[PDB]
Design a protein around this ligand. Structure first.
Ligand SMILES: Nc1nc2c(ncn2C[C@@H](COCCP(=O)(O)O)OCCP(=O)(O)O)c(=O)[nH]1
Ligand SMILES: Nc1nc2c(ncn2C[C@@H](COCCP(=O)(O)O)OCCP(=O)(O)O)c(=O)[nH]1
Lengths: 169, 169
């Protein structure tokens, strides 16, 4: 392992960006029917959890490459607007269930979710994201915005943190 | 011009990243005397203005490459900690003057500022950022996190917005 604080690298930055491009093509296709436009009708990106800023920065740039204009809001007026909620990780689904339910009260045109890392085995309630960059098993990861006690967000890859790190802390 | 909404491209994403690497080397050198460490003593990145999330995402990853561990806070406990305030653009300096003065009240170990775009000719008060990625003349730019009425943040380059865009709006 190229990092002394990690036991395994699960997804490199290159692997994540390749998958993000695949997802962006699907988003571009799915929203082509919506006549999105800068200013007049952007896709509203709602970025949720502090760590999602890395994913959000990379994803909105990729979506722009694919012709999907956005505006960004951070949770860390959508009435009649299309909303895409972005989260770096989906685990119990308790965060997204609450966010999506709250945003629904403002009656957006539609609401969908995009997550960088899904941990499908972590659910405490049923929840399926419309778009998932990558799946992880039930292990604790850091990097690509994900932290351990506010550190390691800047690791370019998604990695499994060594037990020694969090015992030596 | 490669964009139909811009009259000029001022800095490409590639140009910005090259300059960010030069700045990161200076930051790494300047903070080598501080014994920064994940968890125990990270550099505290305070990211200011909604648009700074793109710059912040790219910069913390570059700083990690250069061995500078960070934690991030967004303004959009530092007592005894080193703080680096990041802003996508510095113009009148009124924002950073207030932010730096407020953070000083919590007595950090030190406080410095890093901005992606400086408009040196825009000052309403004297202010010099410790680290500047790029300088722009007194023109209104979008891209690399910078918006016009919440749109165009996702443009990968820093560009001059066409007058037609903001009259046709
Ligand atoms: N670093 C890291 N954080 C994890 C992980 N799983 C959940 N979390 C954190 C958990 C919340 O942590 C986000 C903390 P923030 O980025 O500092 O705001 O994700 C919640 C998703 P859920 O509501 O679907 O359960 C993981 O594997 N690694
Ligand atoms: N898009 C864009 N915004 C500019 C520009 N100059 C100032 N601003 C906006 C201005 C504040 O806008 C940030 C808006 P946010 O990113 O939505 O929160 O920057 C203030 C810096 P100052 O306190 O030193 O004067 C510019 O050229 N382009």
């Amino acid at each position: 392992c190229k990092y002394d604080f990690a036991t395994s690298v699960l997804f490199t930055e290159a692997e994540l960006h390749t998958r993000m491009r695949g997802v962006a093509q699907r988003i571009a296709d799915d929203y082509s029917n919506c006549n999105l436009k800068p200013l007049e009708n952007p896709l509203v990106i709602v970025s949720v959890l502090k760590g999602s800023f890395v994913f959000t920065a990379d994803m909105v740039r990729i979506l722009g490459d694919f012709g999907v204009p956005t505006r960004v809001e951070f949770l860390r007026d959508i009435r009649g607007k299309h909303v895409l909620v972005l989260e770096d990780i989906l685990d119990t689904a308790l965060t997204l269930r609450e966010v999506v339910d709250s945003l629904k009260k403002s009656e957006p045109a539609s609401i969908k979710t995009l997550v960088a890392i899904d941990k499908p085995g972590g659910r405490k309630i049923p929840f399926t994201a419309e778009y998932v960059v990558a799946d992880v098993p039930n292990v604790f990861v850091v990097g690509y915005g994900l932290d351990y006690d506010q550190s390691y967000r800047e690791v370019r890859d998604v990695v499994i943190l060594k037990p020694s790190v969090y015992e030596t802390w």
